[PDB]
DNA sequence: AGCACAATTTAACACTTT
DNA sequence: AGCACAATTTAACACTTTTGTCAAGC
DNA sequence: GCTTGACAAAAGTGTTAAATTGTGCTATACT
């Protein structure tokens, strides 16, 4: 109800997350097992730090 | 753990498109299951990573 | 070797609580039994001040410092930034915490 | 599967568990579990709770 | 033989910083007094507190 | 596929036998891999202990076996294992190059790191001591400025979540100061510096304060050129420049410099 | 000792604003499984045809430009690895051979 | 690329997937880690007549 | 290591075929 | 390991345009 | 207060060579 969650708390509900909820929170699919560059120390695209 | 999950997932996605016998695909799916189980709660089923 | 004091020093990495020990600056740990003592007193506001704008309320920390230096009233606390880490570690366990 | 393979379906793993969860009528199991603890007794009643 | 206290510099060490761009207020304050940017950092060895 | 379009349609006899021949061809491709899985295991069992788990080595060897049975020639009169050992060893070593480090290094740099490490161990065994960078560059036909730079690539990350002392309650992450955080006594000082800057700039004239605020970008954040201010004030760059050169001399006055000298 | 560290990045001190910001236009892409994604862009920006959307799969623009299939191939599709090492006359004189083994083995 | 059961709902005490399907945990581990096929459906009419 | 506790087996039972 | 080859990213240089500065002048 | 001419450094811009990265292949036999 309040994703910013700033000072208006009436309840706090837990529940199972369906697969339609997991691809609704997400901002994109990580598809490579890469973290960061080895030379330029910048995060690689489509990796765990992209 | 995230790297191992996405590694075995990419290898399963390659083995399925390449065409493979059932033993290799079943071994890959069991490895994927064990990787996600190691991510969520380590050391519960089997020996810990 | 034993005397230590801290107004404001280095903060930690993942959760933004202060560090520990005289080697760093570090703040004294206001743990569990001290919270039980302050709840048994009935002091709600000192407990809320020790737990939000002194450890985790990231925009409350510099706002309290500005209000003390300019000489104004201490503002109302926000939400602790170690609670929003818990919502992320519960959502990463596939639990729809809303 | 090669003989009488048209009369059933069988699988392995989490997709088979997903297929079992798909064909799972909750109300039938709920009414049966309500009726077992109402009529029967023994270990069967103590399990069904 | 030099007597030190809390905050004095022991080893003068200066590390290259590469690049960052200043705020407009600090870039104005450099142009008034006439002081260069001095892109290297300052990580000296000072004695600890107390 | 070449006859699944224009060209003909086939009678049921040739359709039946060619579909049976295709289905039989799809079976030996499974039978050969199921035969040589043990060869994959026997090759992969002597690379373990460094980087990757054992099952990942077996699966990359299986991918190499699929490649080797795709590119196998029976008319060269050799056994299958002599040819397939090359592709299986290549698949295992290429996987250990690609997916064994948390920071991914390309395979040529992994190759020169393996060559440098092997040459270092060989010169150590010949010498009975640890070699030197200028000594190592003599063997590897490179500069000694390259050798330490190569050596400062193969340092793997130390895990943040291990106990550091014998007192096990502490981990490593409780000792690392976050240096990119907001220092609370600096963000107040920057605000008071902005207020003092506006208080000093208000004692100037109407046009020179606007010239300074657009030249250094104090109002918008994006600075301007002299032509950009001359466009809005209707003069050339030299008229704006002498206005700025007079205003900066007016700001070096001690009444305008003393209250700002403390902030640098 | 203390061992400061930093995730590589910066913290700038512009006080935030919310009124004058260079103006933006919204594109809309459509992926393969009928999903719609709205992407803001600057006005001085060439809006591309295909965009890697939030779903994880590529989605083209909603217009009918049809820019490029770019002639990308298979790669090696076995066959090619069979045809590059063995020629058609050696296969046709083999396959028929195998075909005759279907005729003789069936009746003995 | 292949489904995966959540480890909290299979390796608990008591196992919730075992209660929800009336399967033993020693059989559930044989199913979801690729050791035993499971029949998931059977056409009763064709097998009857 | 242990202390408690609840879930999951050997075996101990009468009941019903063979 | 080790090598061969294509694809891609970088850095280096030549050349043009912008932005800034000096002296003169009404 | 304001403009013009002239000159020089700084910044874009295009091209081109180098360095850097990605990928295929190596056939005594080996289980």
mmCIF file with all atom_site columns, N, CA and C in Angstrom, chain C residues 15-56:
data_model
loop_
_atom_site.group_PDB
_atom_site.id
_atom_site.type_symbol
_atom_site.label_atom_id
_atom_site.label_alt_id
_atom_site.label_comp_id
_atom_site.label_asym_id
_atom_site.label_entity_id
_atom_site.label_seq_id
_atom_site.pdbx_PDB_ins_code
_atom_site.Cartn_x
_atom_site.Cartn_y
_atom_site.Cartn_z
_atom_site.occupancy
_atom_site.B_iso_or_equiv
_atom_site.pdbx_formal_charge
_atom_site.auth_seq_id
_atom_site.auth_comp_id
_atom_site.auth_asym_id
_atom_site.auth_atom_id
_atom_site.pdbx_PDB_model_num
ATOM 1   N N  . UNK C 1 15 ? 24.260 -2.073 6.955  1.00 0.00 ? 15 UNK C N  1
ATOM 2   C CA . UNK C 1 15 ? 23.425 -1.259 7.819  1.00 0.00 ? 15 UNK C CA 1
ATOM 3   C C  . UNK C 1 15 ? 24.265 -0.102 8.329  1.00 0.00 ? 15 UNK C C  1
ATOM 4   N N  . UNK C 1 16 ? 23.648 1.066  8.470  1.00 0.00 ? 16 UNK C N  1
ATOM 5   C CA . UNK C 1 16 ? 24.408 2.279  8.722  1.00 0.00 ? 16 UNK C CA 1
ATOM 6   C C  . UNK C 1 16 ? 24.570 2.580  10.202 1.00 0.00 ? 16 UNK C C  1
ATOM 7   N N  . UNK C 1 17 ? 24.616 1.555  11.044 1.00 0.00 ? 17 UNK C N  1
ATOM 8   C CA . UNK C 1 17 ? 24.861 1.741  12.458 1.00 0.00 ? 17 UNK C CA 1
ATOM 9   C C  . UNK C 1 17 ? 26.328 2.080  12.688 1.00 0.00 ? 17 UNK C C  1
ATOM 10  N N  . UNK C 1 18 ? 26.658 2.711  13.815 1.00 0.00 ? 18 UNK C N  1
ATOM 11  C CA . UNK C 1 18 ? 28.057 3.059  14.076 1.00 0.00 ? 18 UNK C CA 1
ATOM 12  C C  . UNK C 1 18 ? 28.949 1.851  14.279 1.00 0.00 ? 18 UNK C C  1
ATOM 13  N N  . UNK C 1 19 ? 30.249 2.111  14.305 1.00 0.00 ? 19 UNK C N  1
ATOM 14  C CA . UNK C 1 19 ? 31.217 1.044  14.480 1.00 0.00 ? 19 UNK C CA 1
ATOM 15  C C  . UNK C 1 19 ? 31.358 0.699  15.957 1.00 0.00 ? 19 UNK C C  1
ATOM 16  N N  . UNK C 1 20 ? 32.405 -0.047 16.283 1.00 0.00 ? 20 UNK C N  1
ATOM 17  C CA . UNK C 1 20 ? 32.655 -0.470 17.647 1.00 0.00 ? 20 UNK C CA 1
ATOM 18  C C  . UNK C 1 20 ? 34.129 -0.489 17.992 1.00 0.00 ? 20 UNK C C  1
ATOM 19  N N  . UNK C 1 21 ? 34.443 -0.044 19.198 1.00 0.00 ? 21 UNK C N  1
ATOM 20  C CA . UNK C 1 21 ? 35.776 -0.180 19.735 1.00 0.00 ? 21 UNK C CA 1
ATOM 21  C C  . UNK C 1 21 ? 36.569 1.113  19.667 1.00 0.00 ? 21 UNK C C  1
ATOM 22  N N  . UNK C 1 22 ? 37.568 1.206  20.538 1.00 0.00 ? 22 UNK C N  1
ATOM 23  C CA . UNK C 1 22 ? 38.415 2.384  20.621 1.00 0.00 ? 22 UNK C CA 1
ATOM 24  C C  . UNK C 1 22 ? 39.404 2.485  19.467 1.00 0.00 ? 22 UNK C C  1
ATOM 25  N N  . UNK C 1 23 ? 39.638 1.398  18.728 1.00 0.00 ? 23 UNK C N  1
ATOM 26  C CA . UNK C 1 23 ? 40.515 1.463  17.564 1.00 0.00 ? 23 UNK C CA 1
ATOM 27  C C  . UNK C 1 23 ? 39.873 2.282  16.455 1.00 0.00 ? 23 UNK C C  1
ATOM 28  N N  . UNK C 1 24 ? 38.612 1.992  16.156 1.00 0.00 ? 24 UNK C N  1
ATOM 29  C CA . UNK C 1 24 ? 37.753 2.907  15.427 1.00 0.00 ? 24 UNK C CA 1
ATOM 30  C C  . UNK C 1 24 ? 37.227 3.963  16.394 1.00 0.00 ? 24 UNK C C  1
ATOM 31  N N  . UNK C 1 25 ? 36.187 4.689  16.001 1.00 0.00 ? 25 UNK C N  1
ATOM 32  C CA . UNK C 1 25 ? 35.567 5.521  17.023 1.00 0.00 ? 25 UNK C CA 1
ATOM 33  C C  . UNK C 1 25 ? 34.574 4.713  17.840 1.00 0.00 ? 25 UNK C C  1
ATOM 34  N N  . UNK C 1 26 ? 33.486 4.284  17.231 1.00 0.00 ? 26 UNK C N  1
ATOM 35  C CA . UNK C 1 26 ? 32.615 3.324  17.868 1.00 0.00 ? 26 UNK C CA 1
ATOM 36  C C  . UNK C 1 26 ? 31.724 3.914  18.946 1.00 0.00 ? 26 UNK C C  1
ATOM 37  N N  . UNK C 1 27 ? 30.498 3.427  18.977 1.00 0.00 ? 27 UNK C N  1
ATOM 38  C CA . UNK C 1 27 ? 29.544 3.874  19.973 1.00 0.00 ? 27 UNK C CA 1
ATOM 39  C C  . UNK C 1 27 ? 29.247 2.744  20.922 1.00 0.00 ? 27 UNK C C  1
ATOM 40  N N  . UNK C 1 28 ? 28.848 3.102  22.135 1.00 0.00 ? 28 UNK C N  1
ATOM 41  C CA . UNK C 1 28 ? 28.506 2.090  23.116 1.00 0.00 ? 28 UNK C CA 1
ATOM 42  C C  . UNK C 1 28 ? 27.204 1.410  22.732 1.00 0.00 ? 28 UNK C C  1
ATOM 43  N N  . UNK C 1 29 ? 27.184 0.094  22.872 1.00 0.00 ? 29 UNK C N  1
ATOM 44  C CA . UNK C 1 29 ? 26.068 -0.708 22.401 1.00 0.00 ? 29 UNK C CA 1
ATOM 45  C C  . UNK C 1 29 ? 24.912 -0.588 23.374 1.00 0.00 ? 29 UNK C C  1
ATOM 46  N N  . UNK C 1 30 ? 23.784 -0.096 22.886 1.00 0.00 ? 30 UNK C N  1
ATOM 47  C CA . UNK C 1 30 ? 22.561 -0.022 23.672 1.00 0.00 ? 30 UNK C CA 1
ATOM 48  C C  . UNK C 1 30 ? 21.754 -1.255 23.295 1.00 0.00 ? 30 UNK C C  1
ATOM 49  N N  . UNK C 1 31 ? 22.019 -2.361 23.980 1.00 0.00 ? 31 UNK C N  1
ATOM 50  C CA . UNK C 1 31 ? 21.551 -3.658 23.538 1.00 0.00 ? 31 UNK C CA 1
ATOM 51  C C  . UNK C 1 31 ? 20.110 -3.977 23.865 1.00 0.00 ? 31 UNK C C  1
ATOM 52  N N  . UNK C 1 32 ? 19.858 -5.190 24.341 1.00 0.00 ? 32 UNK C N  1
ATOM 53  C CA . UNK C 1 32 ? 18.499 -5.647 24.583 1.00 0.00 ? 32 UNK C CA 1
ATOM 54  C C  . UNK C 1 32 ? 18.025 -5.327 25.992 1.00 0.00 ? 32 UNK C C  1
ATOM 55  N N  . UNK C 1 33 ? 18.843 -5.648 26.995 1.00 0.00 ? 33 UNK C N  1
ATOM 56  C CA . UNK C 1 33 ? 18.429 -5.465 28.379 1.00 0.00 ? 33 UNK C CA 1
ATOM 57  C C  . UNK C 1 33 ? 18.315 -3.993 28.742 1.00 0.00 ? 33 UNK C C  1
ATOM 58  N N  . UNK C 1 34 ? 19.105 -3.141 28.099 1.00 0.00 ? 34 UNK C N  1
ATOM 59  C CA . UNK C 1 34 ? 18.949 -1.707 28.283 1.00 0.00 ? 34 UNK C CA 1
ATOM 60  C C  . UNK C 1 34 ? 17.640 -1.215 27.678 1.00 0.00 ? 34 UNK C C  1
ATOM 61  N N  . UNK C 1 35 ? 17.212 -1.823 26.570 1.00 0.00 ? 35 UNK C N  1
ATOM 62  C CA . UNK C 1 35 ? 15.905 -1.492 26.017 1.00 0.00 ? 35 UNK C CA 1
ATOM 63  C C  . UNK C 1 35 ? 14.785 -1.952 26.937 1.00 0.00 ? 35 UNK C C  1
ATOM 64  N N  . UNK C 1 36 ? 14.943 -3.113 27.585 1.00 0.00 ? 36 UNK C N  1
ATOM 65  C CA . UNK C 1 36 ? 13.927 -3.557 28.537 1.00 0.00 ? 36 UNK C CA 1
ATOM 66  C C  . UNK C 1 36 ? 13.849 -2.623 29.735 1.00 0.00 ? 36 UNK C C  1
ATOM 67  N N  . UNK C 1 37 ? 14.994 -2.108 30.179 1.00 0.00 ? 37 UNK C N  1
ATOM 68  C CA . UNK C 1 37 ? 14.999 -1.168 31.294 1.00 0.00 ? 37 UNK C CA 1
ATOM 69  C C  . UNK C 1 37 ? 14.330 0.146  30.922 1.00 0.00 ? 37 UNK C C  1
ATOM 70  N N  . UNK C 1 38 ? 14.591 0.649  29.717 1.00 0.00 ? 38 UNK C N  1
ATOM 71  C CA . UNK C 1 38 ? 13.960 1.904  29.323 1.00 0.00 ? 38 UNK C CA 1
ATOM 72  C C  . UNK C 1 38 ? 12.479 1.731  29.015 1.00 0.00 ? 38 UNK C C  1
ATOM 73  N N  . UNK C 1 39 ? 12.050 0.536  28.598 1.00 0.00 ? 39 UNK C N  1
ATOM 74  C CA . UNK C 1 39 ? 10.619 0.288  28.448 1.00 0.00 ? 39 UNK C CA 1
ATOM 75  C C  . UNK C 1 39 ? 9.939  0.167  29.800 1.00 0.00 ? 39 UNK C C  1
ATOM 76  N N  . UNK C 1 40 ? 10.614 -0.447 30.774 1.00 0.00 ? 40 UNK C N  1
ATOM 77  C CA . UNK C 1 40 ? 10.045 -0.575 32.107 1.00 0.00 ? 40 UNK C CA 1
ATOM 78  C C  . UNK C 1 40 ? 9.995  0.751  32.837 1.00 0.00 ? 40 UNK C C  1
ATOM 79  N N  . UNK C 1 41 ? 10.841 1.707  32.456 1.00 0.00 ? 41 UNK C N  1
ATOM 80  C CA . UNK C 1 41 ? 10.700 3.052  32.998 1.00 0.00 ? 41 UNK C CA 1
ATOM 81  C C  . UNK C 1 41 ? 9.443  3.736  32.495 1.00 0.00 ? 41 UNK C C  1
ATOM 82  N N  . UNK C 1 42 ? 9.082  3.509  31.240 1.00 0.00 ? 42 UNK C N  1
ATOM 83  C CA . UNK C 1 42 ? 8.037  4.266  30.598 1.00 0.00 ? 42 UNK C CA 1
ATOM 84  C C  . UNK C 1 42 ? 8.529  5.400  29.736 1.00 0.00 ? 42 UNK C C  1
ATOM 85  N N  . UNK C 1 43 ? 9.829  5.474  29.474 1.00 0.00 ? 43 UNK C N  1
ATOM 86  C CA . UNK C 1 43 ? 10.403 6.536  28.654 1.00 0.00 ? 43 UNK C CA 1
ATOM 87  C C  . UNK C 1 43 ? 10.354 6.099  27.199 1.00 0.00 ? 43 UNK C C  1
ATOM 88  N N  . UNK C 1 44 ? 9.306  6.508  26.491 1.00 0.00 ? 44 UNK C N  1
ATOM 89  C CA . UNK C 1 44 ? 9.183  6.151  25.085 1.00 0.00 ? 44 UNK C CA 1
ATOM 90  C C  . UNK C 1 44 ? 10.100 6.988  24.207 1.00 0.00 ? 44 UNK C C  1
ATOM 91  N N  . UNK C 1 45 ? 10.264 8.266  24.542 1.00 0.00 ? 45 UNK C N  1
ATOM 92  C CA . UNK C 1 45 ? 10.940 9.187  23.640 1.00 0.00 ? 45 UNK C CA 1
ATOM 93  C C  . UNK C 1 45 ? 12.447 9.001  23.658 1.00 0.00 ? 45 UNK C C  1
ATOM 94  N N  . UNK C 1 46 ? 13.024 8.670  24.816 1.00 0.00 ? 46 UNK C N  1
ATOM 95  C CA . UNK C 1 46 ? 14.459 8.416  24.865 1.00 0.00 ? 46 UNK C CA 1
ATOM 96  C C  . UNK C 1 46 ? 14.811 7.130  24.137 1.00 0.00 ? 46 UNK C C  1
ATOM 97  N N  . UNK C 1 47 ? 13.938 6.128  24.212 1.00 0.00 ? 47 UNK C N  1
ATOM 98  C CA . UNK C 1 47 ? 14.153 4.892  23.472 1.00 0.00 ? 47 UNK C CA 1
ATOM 99  C C  . UNK C 1 47 ? 14.054 5.126  21.972 1.00 0.00 ? 47 UNK C C  1
ATOM 100 N N  . UNK C 1 48 ? 13.058 5.904  21.541 1.00 0.00 ? 48 UNK C N  1
ATOM 101 C CA . UNK C 1 48 ? 12.927 6.210  20.121 1.00 0.00 ? 48 UNK C CA 1
ATOM 102 C C  . UNK C 1 48 ? 14.076 7.072  19.617 1.00 0.00 ? 48 UNK C C  1
ATOM 103 N N  . UNK C 1 49 ? 14.627 7.933  20.468 1.00 0.00 ? 49 UNK C N  1
ATOM 104 C CA . UNK C 1 49 ? 15.770 8.736  20.057 1.00 0.00 ? 49 UNK C CA 1
ATOM 105 C C  . UNK C 1 49 ? 17.033 7.894  19.977 1.00 0.00 ? 49 UNK C C  1
ATOM 106 N N  . UNK C 1 50 ? 17.219 6.964  20.915 1.00 0.00 ? 50 UNK C N  1
ATOM 107 C CA . UNK C 1 50 ? 18.406 6.117  20.883 1.00 0.00 ? 50 UNK C CA 1
ATOM 108 C C  . UNK C 1 50 ? 18.359 5.124  19.736 1.00 0.00 ? 50 UNK C C  1
ATOM 109 N N  . UNK C 1 51 ? 17.170 4.780  19.255 1.00 0.00 ? 51 UNK C N  1
ATOM 110 C CA . UNK C 1 51 ? 17.088 3.742  18.243 1.00 0.00 ? 51 UNK C CA 1
ATOM 111 C C  . UNK C 1 51 ? 16.891 4.249  16.821 1.00 0.00 ? 51 UNK C C  1
ATOM 112 N N  . UNK C 1 52 ? 16.578 5.526  16.608 1.00 0.00 ? 52 UNK C N  1
ATOM 113 C CA . UNK C 1 52 ? 16.380 6.016  15.251 1.00 0.00 ? 52 UNK C CA 1
ATOM 114 C C  . UNK C 1 52 ? 17.410 7.057  14.835 1.00 0.00 ? 52 UNK C C  1
ATOM 115 N N  . UNK C 1 53 ? 17.462 8.207  15.507 1.00 0.00 ? 53 UNK C N  1
ATOM 116 C CA . UNK C 1 53 ? 18.218 9.347  14.997 1.00 0.00 ? 53 UNK C CA 1
ATOM 117 C C  . UNK C 1 53 ? 19.638 9.318  15.520 1.00 0.00 ? 53 UNK C C  1
ATOM 118 N N  . UNK C 1 54 ? 19.976 8.277  16.260 1.00 0.00 ? 54 UNK C N  1
ATOM 119 C CA . UNK C 1 54 ? 21.336 8.079  16.712 1.00 0.00 ? 54 UNK C CA 1
ATOM 120 C C  . UNK C 1 54 ? 22.011 6.879  16.081 1.00 0.00 ? 54 UNK C C  1
ATOM 121 N N  . UNK C 1 55 ? 21.268 5.997  15.424 1.00 0.00 ? 55 UNK C N  1
ATOM 122 C CA . UNK C 1 55 ? 21.866 4.859  14.745 1.00 0.00 ? 55 UNK C CA 1
ATOM 123 C C  . UNK C 1 55 ? 21.539 4.819  13.261 1.00 0.00 ? 55 UNK C C  1
ATOM 124 N N  . UNK C 1 56 ? 20.263 4.813  12.894 1.00 0.00 ? 56 UNK C N  1
ATOM 125 C CA . UNK C 1 56 ? 19.869 4.337  11.581 1.00 0.00 ? 56 UNK C CA 1
ATOM 126 C C  . UNK C 1 56 ? 19.180 5.364  10.707 1.00 0.00 ? 56 UNK C C  1
#
